Amino acid sequence: FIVCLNKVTKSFPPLADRFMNAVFFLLPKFHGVLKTLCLEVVLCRVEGMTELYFQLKSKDFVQVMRHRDDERQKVCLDIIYKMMPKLKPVELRELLNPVVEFVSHPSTTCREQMYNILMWIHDNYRDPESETDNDSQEIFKLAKDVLI
């Protein structure tokens, strides 16, 4: 029933409260499967989401993500990592790490998003040697390993 709820839902509202609550807990259980409701309804959720759910994202998403040996199934997770604004502390850094980590393996379809998101937020954090901090700079260097 919930798969119907999002399969309809994708087109129009993403109304945070009404389904977001439901799929929040419901879609993990069937995510225990990786087909159908995970595969599909998990995606329709996270994309419809946007800025809400960033919290359960910052930990639950790293619980899954690697879970997606299917990168195509994981495109929702490349698009999901539009949390470039949020999760500013160590979480953003660590979450950046398996992104780079899964592309040293797959096809190339996920590379488009991997790259571009790294390009916008790294290019946006990119100052000419001006720096910021000692913990986010290690990020920035890693990102150099990436783009390079």
Swiss-Prot record:
Q: What does the PTM comment of the record read?
A: Autophosphorylated at two clusters, the T2609 cluster and the S2056 cluster. Autophosphorylation induces a conformational change that leads to remodeling of the DNA-PK complex, requisite for efficient end processing and DNA repair. S-nitrosylated by GAPDH.
Cystines in this chain: none
Compartments where found:
Nucleus; Nucleus, Nucleolus; Cytoplasm, Cytosol
* Function of the protein: Serine/threonine-protein kinase that acts as a molecular sensor for DNA damage. Involved in DNA non-homologous end joining (NHEJ) required for double-strand break (DSB) repair and V(D)J recombination. Must be bound to DNA to express its catalytic properties. Promotes processing of hairpin DNA structures in V(D)J recombination by activation of the hairpin endonuclease artemis (DCLRE1C). Recruited by XRCC5 and XRCC6 to DNA ends and is required to (1) protect and align broken ends of DNA, thereby preventing their degradation, (2) and sequester the DSB for repair by NHEJ.
Which family does the similarity line name? Answer: Belongs to the PI3/PI4-kinase family.
Q: How does it assemble?
A: DNA-PK is a heterotrimer of PRKDC and the Ku dimer (composed of XRCC6/Ku70 and XRCC5/Ku86). Formation of this complex may be promoted by interaction with ILF3. Component of the core long-range non-homologous end joining (NHEJ) complex (also named DNA-PK complex) composed of PRKDC, LIG4, XRCC4, XRCC6/Ku70, XRCC5/Ku86 and NHEJ1/XLF. Additional component of the NHEJ complex includes PAXX. Following autophosphorylation, PRKDC dissociates from DNA. Interacts with DNA-PKcs-interacting protein (KIP) with the region upstream the kinase domain.
Involvement in disease = Immunodeficiency 26 with or without neurologic abnormalities: A form of severe combined immunodeficiency characterized by reduced or absent T and B cells, recurrent candidiasis, and lower respiratory tract infections. Some patients show dysmorphic features, severe growth failure, microcephaly, seizures, and impaired neurological functions.
- Name of the protein in question: DNA-dependent protein kinase catalytic subunit
Quick one: which gene encodes this? PRKDC
Span of the entire protein shown here: 2360 to 2507 of 4128
